[PDB]
Amino acid sequence: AAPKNRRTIEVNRCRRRNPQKLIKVKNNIDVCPECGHLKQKHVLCAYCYEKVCKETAEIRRQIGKQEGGPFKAPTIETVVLYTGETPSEQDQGKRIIERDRKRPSWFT
Amino acid sequence: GKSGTWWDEHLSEENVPFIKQLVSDEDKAQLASKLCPLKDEPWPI
Amino acid sequence: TEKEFMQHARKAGLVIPPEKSDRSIHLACTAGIFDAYVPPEGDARISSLSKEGLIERTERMKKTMASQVSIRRIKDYDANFKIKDFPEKAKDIFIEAHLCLNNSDHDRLHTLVTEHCFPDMTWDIKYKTVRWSFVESLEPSHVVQVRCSSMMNQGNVYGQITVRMHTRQTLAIYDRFGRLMYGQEDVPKDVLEYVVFEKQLTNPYGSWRMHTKIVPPWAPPKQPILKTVMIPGPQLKPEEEYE
Amino acid sequence: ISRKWEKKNKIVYPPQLPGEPRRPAEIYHCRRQIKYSKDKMWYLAKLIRGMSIDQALAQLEFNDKKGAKIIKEVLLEAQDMAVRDHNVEFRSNLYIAESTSGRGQCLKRIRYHGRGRFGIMEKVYCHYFVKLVEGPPPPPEPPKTAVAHAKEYIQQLRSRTIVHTL
Amino acid sequence: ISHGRVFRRMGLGPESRIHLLRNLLTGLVRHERIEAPWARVDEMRGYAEKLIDYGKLGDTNERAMRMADFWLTEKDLIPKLFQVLAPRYKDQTGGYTRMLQIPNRSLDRAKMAVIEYKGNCLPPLPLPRRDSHLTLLNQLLQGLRQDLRQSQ
Amino acid sequence: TARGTPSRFLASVLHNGLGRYVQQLQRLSFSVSRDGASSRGAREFVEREVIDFARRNPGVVIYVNSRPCCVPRVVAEYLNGAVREESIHCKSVEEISTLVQKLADQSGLDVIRIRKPFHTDNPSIQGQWHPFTNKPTTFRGLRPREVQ
Amino acid sequence: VKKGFRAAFRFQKELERQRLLRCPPPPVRRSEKPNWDYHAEIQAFGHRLQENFSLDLLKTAFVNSCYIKSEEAKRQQLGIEKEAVLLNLKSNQELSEQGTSFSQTCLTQFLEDEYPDMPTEGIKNLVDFLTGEEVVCHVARNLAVEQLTLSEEFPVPPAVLQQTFFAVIGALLQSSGPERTALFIRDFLITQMTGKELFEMWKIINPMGLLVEELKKRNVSAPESRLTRQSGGTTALPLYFVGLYCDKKLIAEGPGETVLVAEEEAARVALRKLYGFTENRRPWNYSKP
Amino acid sequence: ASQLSPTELTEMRNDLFNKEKARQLSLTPRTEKIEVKHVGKTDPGTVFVMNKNISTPYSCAMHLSEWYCRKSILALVDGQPWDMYKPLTKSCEIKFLTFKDCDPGEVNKAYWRSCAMMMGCVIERAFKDEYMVNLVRAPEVPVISGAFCYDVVLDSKLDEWMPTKENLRSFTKDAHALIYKDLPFETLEVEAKVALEIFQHSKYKVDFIEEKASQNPERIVKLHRIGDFIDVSEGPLIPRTSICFQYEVSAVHNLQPTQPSLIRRFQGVSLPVHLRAHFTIWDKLLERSRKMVTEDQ
Ligand SMILES: [Mg+2]
Ligand SMILES: [Zn+2]
């Protein structure tokens, strides 16, 4: 195929400036009760997500430092702790993984 | 501007089943009320 | 099909005069002040002519003797110089400097003041307009301390003269758009300041230029801002805030 | 190379009179040499246009493009320079008045086709212009109803007179 | 035409798709948290439900043992799955593996999601909590409910 | 063409033909060079006929700046405020005389399109025509297809 | 490079023209320009009107009190004493008042001898419109006397322009005879009423009230409205013709889109016909007796 | 207390209120800087430098973002309820609230009081000028109640009629028209003396002002203004009036065995724009609010 002429700037404007190709304005942006870093409906907040991801990464680092080599997988449940906090009576058969910081207010 | 909204947005955890049961009973009663149309005011046959 | 971008420069002034060279820099001032003058605590209460002398007048006599020997030194180095008409000279120099700063004058303000207080009076005002004006002077100005240094770095000495001043000024700082921001219009407010003048003695000419101004710690607060200032806290990174 | 957009923030105005309005502020800011396409930057500018700064930041934070974060940082630094230097107290009382895109300096490379021929690879570059004005954002132009069209038609039929004689 | 047909294709065929799903299932059994596209995590949850069901059905069964040995390429995860995740859900049926949606990725901007089992020693994800039972609409609904209860 | 240049109407500046006729031209600033071969016509004009041109109409003031230039020009201002500046570069005495006479005879209106050379202020005398003209009125103005 | 200078000069002139066209500078008065002469302009203005003015009266009328105040303020703020010409300027107030009174009485006399059927309010509004600010400002701008008026403000407010116009009118009255100034103000004011509608210069509110008052003053009963012709009563573009009948006799007729505007137009036509100021009246005789 | 047209009374009321506001804003000399702190939860450790008796909490929220201005109804100042349009005095701490919070009680009370005041304002201008009307008070009903009430005394000639659905529809249309225009709830801590001196007409308003000023030794009431109407209410209110998205009045109930004359008690339900529901819940709340409800004891 080969054009016989040349498209004009008017046709280009009518083709690229149509409301179909323009980005639509979404109305799903709100605020978050906690922290508040501009979230969206049906979507988790990035701030708390990053916080829990960092916490899970630290817990996995501590587990790997306690386990040592690969190919382990204990046959008992696990429970994480923080500064102080003596182990309860119903947490005897569970693996204790203590950290080195205070307990956050969003983890009970 | 005005954002999107539905019916189960601003409801608590103990109000959605209540509203569901209420509207279900309401539509069931409305369907049962229109069971005998001849005894009301029927048009001449 | 083999071309790149040029123009590789930096926006930072590093050191390059004294790196393997035989030409130094002939300055005309210094860094800060030689000795900080300490005004009396009861200056506002005893703002009249004179009062009763305090106990142990040895320190004031020693300061007077130091001022006298500094005056003797600056007279032996350069004769023909008065002291009584020096406060009036400092007053008119300050007045003409404020006037040329109000009229947006630089080629004259550079020689009226020193190389130290010029940025402090031209930085946060370059994009703003001022309506400063002198109305009337109250208490006459007097000299409180006369000192001089003897730095033998490049053979240049200076003579800072701390001369107090108390008068009434009219400040009116607008904005770059034409709206008011800081001071009001014609308001004859009362405020005092301690201004020191420094002159390069070793210079073959030498002009009495305003060095800087020292503010006492017990000075009353300035007038508030006409707008609202917001002071946000630190950026809360994904961790925890303990404060 | 010409640079006249970053210098509009130095236009000093004379002091106004007490019998004059407030006059909104004008903040100009733009970046140079941005690895992006001008069409996508213009699409983002058309998405922004005349809206609030907070709404623009919210729309750009969830915009899955490359220049979205760039425009977000541009708006952030412009608001910062406005509240620090342009004498702006309110952070949410701003709106974008003008927002367009330009074209940057381009280079030339090769493409390597499937024979001895080739193409001219022109490194496309662009910029981004934006202006911040204080005060509340102006409301959009409402569509004219049938009353406006009727009045205009009546005015057009009343304005016509005799023609081609006297 | 794909009416009433799921089985979202991912790899170069059914074998590659099953291998990727098995790898995702092994990673979910090990780390208990994996971020991946919505279709991948959906299929992973759909397979993990039946995996938990088969692990709960019994341990001495050869069918469940072979299925656990096939769907787990790390071996050590089989005793864990049979002695931790099986006695945990002894009171639940098929109510587990909660799915939550995340925004996008900082690489190709793709829709992803994160799923995890119940309980979980790891800190829980920020769940989209509903409004409290003290707002105006909730208080009006509670008042209407109390009124219709006292009137009945 | 007419679709590329603006147009106006044909009208008087302040009704000169009704009351009394006044001179529209006011000042004539001439710029004749001292030495050169491009202002000989203007020099001869100022030498021989500028006195007669000034004495012909007392309502026109003639200014001779005599500035050493290269292109002789003339500024003509009218009552309405229009300023038409033309150049008399290399022209004879008769040409300059005809030009200044045409400038003095005209007014300050534009030399664009005339648009309708005839203009009247009271076009309707015996009543302007309307669609109801030449139509007789029926009894009581009864419209057709009625009963009363 | 391209050798040349004439083409470069023409291009620079074109650039300067584009610069002055895009950024229009504030216009300056004709007095501050080099090619300007006050006495020559005064003589030209005196000779172009086919009259016989005087230099002293024109120099006294072409000034203002604001100009004298500005001059004395400028001479006092600097220090130069000029009391040998400033104290003999003589403001143009009494001459302006005399010219205003003469113009008013001449216009009233003309409207009385030409339109005998004009009431007091009608002739009052006519002489107020003829002496209005807009008409005198337009006449002064077309006569090129604003550049000769010595006063502050370049655009010149309408008050000062009307004042100096009345002042030069009074000067012409004091110089020449009354008939010359009468013919002058006639030819320079009444020529503006050509083609203009009567009520456009009067601007009444209730034409029916004044119409019935004039009819009661003419021993007439009371007018009543009747629908003559009509076209389209249910469409968006209606047309009606209301005819005023007095004692079973038509007097006028007025069209309109509705019935109210049609009756108003009919009343206006009847009132203009009763006053004798119609479109078929005798035109003003611009001749000499 | 004398014969006054139904225009000059509100004229003198609003001009006296404007004079009082001018005196309050001119009582302070210059602009005193205050240090108000933000002890919320979203952005902790934020201190603002505002003015004294000039700055408003809405202007303080404008320094943050547009969300803090779109989702804000009542402010918490040292544990006391504070609206968004009220100048501050001393330096302390501020906290913003919203409808979708943990314990939304003060915001709900303020919204109910604002809706009652708006209903009173829209009903005090929908009667005949020949029939005198009086406004008793606005009793604080709990959120569990069906609809808020507002006692209005009519004329003695109208003690036997019942408003049909047309009057209710007209009242709802007038309420929607009043909500369409943006009119803030301008309040001011007016002294009780001048507060009772401005009225001096309806005895019910004077008695209400006396009862609300007899509880505090400072003798300071809380007056509000909606464009050109002055009413006496308790506590703060809502900032803007465009928050109410759905407004509809139920019916009316008349109590007789309590006072010789006949008094009217109108009810109504309202829902904000942030907590809008569907049509089913709307008609349910409309039908449930038509019942008689009282919580005066
Ligand atoms: Mg694929
Ligand atoms: Zn969050």
Could you walk me through the main structural features you see in this protein, from its secondary elements to its overall organization?
This is part of a larger assembly, with eight protein chains of eight kinds. Chain A has 108 residues and is an alpha+beta fold. Chain A contains two helices and four strands; from the N terminus they run αββαββ. Chain A has one domain. Chain A has a two-stranded antiparallel ribbon with strand order 1-2. In chain A, strands 3-4 form a two-stranded parallel ribbon. Chain A is elongated, with a radius of gyration of 27 Å. Chain E has 152 residues and is mainly alpha-helical. Chain E has one domain: Ribosomal protein L17 (50s Ribosomal Protein L17, Chain: A). In chain E, α1 crosses α2. The two termini of chain H are 32 Å apart. The radius of gyration of chain H is 20 Å and the shape is globular. In chain H, the strands form three sheets. A five-stranded mixed sheet of chain H has the order 2-1-5-3-4. In chain H, strands 6, 7, 11, 12 and 13 form a five-stranded antiparallel sheet that branches. A three-stranded antiparallel sheet of chain H has the order 8-9-10. Chains in contact: A-B, A-C, A-D, A-E, A-H, B-E, B-H, C-D, C-H, D-H, E-H, F-G. The interface between B and E is small, with 9 and 11 residues. Zinc ion binds next to α2 of chain A. The PDB classes it as ribosome. Keywords: mitochondrial elongation factor-G1, 55S ribosome, ribosome.
Q: Spatial order of the strands in the main sheet of chain H?
A: 2-1-5-3-4
Backbone CA Rg of chain G: 28 Å
Task: Identify the bound ligands.
Answer: magnesium ion, zinc ion
Strand order of the largest sheet of chain G: 1-2-3
Order of helices and strands of chain H: HEEHHEEEHEEHEHHEEEEEH
How much of the sequence lies in strands of chain G comes to 5-15%
Q: What is the SS-derived class of chain G?
A: mainly alpha
Question: Fraction of residues of chain G in helices?
Answer: 40-55%
Instruction: Note the main sheet of chain G.
Output: 3 strands, antiparallel
Shape of chain H: globular
Note the run of SSEs of chain G as H and E.
HHHHHHHHHHHEEEH
* Count of distinct strands of chain H: 13
Strand content of chain H: 15-25%
GO cellular component, one term (chain D): mitochondrion
Family (chain D): Belongs to the universal ribosomal protein uL22 family.
Protein name (chain D): Large ribosomal subunit protein uL22m
Subcellular location (chain D): Mitochondrion
